């Protein structure tokens, strides 16, 4: 056909809807084949291959079982589509809703029990709906939210709508936190989670021709004036340290990790110069009050930021 769904509906329509008696039939064949498989599989462990006629028929019981599973599914595909119709427009594509529903249908068939004497559509509707709604919670948001959080976001919505109708207005965070039995600060945190992102490719120019995305600054971009001044600062420190003693500057450089970029502990500096960490603590305080001396500090003042 012309559309994609019109094409899938054509092929699901080519099967025939079962009545109560058939569903029970297929159900038996499915379970019969499964047990036939598990039994023969049990033989693989201990061997004991069956007689020729008993082996050829067991292989058929299984093939017929799978043919049953496939037929029970192909017959109820219409039921999946009938449920997915109502969940569209909520942020999942119709076909995806259908395919997820079919996943639920598959489990309904696996866990279905024919001895309860209930029509198949009764039990499968539960799984197909849960499969679709569970699916929506894992997918429809660009930034995923876990199921338990998607559960509260929805609840908070209904409370607001129900509360909206009774109050003829929208409820405040306190009314909402009260009706839902939560702290008002939580309902705010929840309302921040429910925000959904926007397209950088939107055109907001509105006879501006531009798109949003190109108005976004790059904050991590290199700033020429800073990097240049930072390079000039790096030189001015090199000089100020020249006034200090070979060991005075040596300790300062290892203390802040100027050369390596890796700072060092008072003990570690004492290990290179062969002294106790305290002695290094002392040499520290002295060279710092030397740096604080206005002669050396006056030049670095303009570098505050």
């Amino acid at each position: 056909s012309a559309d994609s769904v019109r094409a899938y509906l054509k092929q699901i329509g080519k099967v025939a809807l079962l009545n109560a008696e058939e569903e029970v039939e297929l159900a038996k064949r499915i379970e019969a084949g499964l047990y036939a498989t598990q039994k023969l599989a049990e033989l693989a462990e201990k061997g004991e291959k069956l007689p020729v006629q008993q082996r050829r028929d067991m292989q058929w019981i299984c093939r017929d079982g799978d043919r049953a599973k496939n037929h029970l599914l192909e017959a109820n595909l219409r039921l999946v589509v009938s449920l997915a119709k109502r969940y569209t427009g909520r942020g999942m594509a119709f076909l995806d809703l259908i395919q997820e529903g079919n996943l639920g249908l598959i489990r309904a068939v696996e866990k279905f029990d024919y001895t309860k004497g209930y029509k198949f559509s009764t039990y499968a509707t539960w799984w197909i709906r849960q499969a679709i709604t569970r699916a929506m919670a894992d997918q429809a948001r660009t930034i995923r939210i876990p199921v338990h959080m998607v559960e509260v976001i929805n609840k908070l919505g209904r409370i607001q709508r129900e509360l909206l109708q009774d109050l003829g207005r929208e409820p405040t965070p306190e009314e909402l936190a009260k009706e839902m039995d939560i702290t008002p600060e939580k309902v705010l945190e929840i309302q921040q989670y429910a925000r959904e992102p926007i397209s950088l490719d939107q055109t907001i120019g509105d006879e501006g021709d531009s798109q949003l995305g190109d108005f976004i600054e790059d904050s991590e971009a290199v700033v020429a004036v800073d990097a240049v001044s930072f390079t000039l600062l790096q030189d001015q420190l090199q000089s100020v340290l020249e006034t200090l003693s070979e060991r005075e500057a040596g300790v300062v450089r290892l203390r802040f990790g100027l050369t390596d970029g890796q700072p060092r502990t008072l003990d570690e500096i004492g290990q290179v110069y062969g002294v106790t960490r305290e002695r290094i603590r002392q040499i520290e305080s002295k060279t710092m009050s030397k740096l604080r001396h206005p002669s050396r500090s006056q030049v670095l003042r303009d570098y505050l930021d």
Binding site: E31, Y35, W60, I61
Partner: protein, 83 residues
């Protein structure tokens, strides 16, 4: 300051992963290829706590008892014997 380990994916491809030497080398590494891969050194330490997945047979077993399955199969084969 790095040691390099090699892993092998199930399909035969091999990948070099540079690590820090002081670190403890993992026995499996998610690889650029997209598959798990196994170290070519001694271990290979662990079973990795496997918990076999749930299967259709399991879901059938927890409702029908094995005896019920036998009779239903008896019904099926006997229907097959009639020709």
């Amino acid at each position: 300051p790095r040691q390099v380990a090699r892993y092998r994916t199930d399909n035969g491809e091999e990948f070099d992963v540079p690590f820090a030497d002081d670190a403890e080398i993992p026995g499996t590494w998610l690889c650029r290829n997209g598959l798990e891969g196994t170290l070519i050194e001694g271990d290979v330490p662990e079973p990795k706590k496997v918990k076999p997945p749930r299967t259709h047979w399991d879901m059938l077993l927890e409702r029908r008892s094995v005896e019920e399955l036998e009779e239903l199969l008896k019904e099926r084969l006997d229907l097959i014997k009639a020709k």
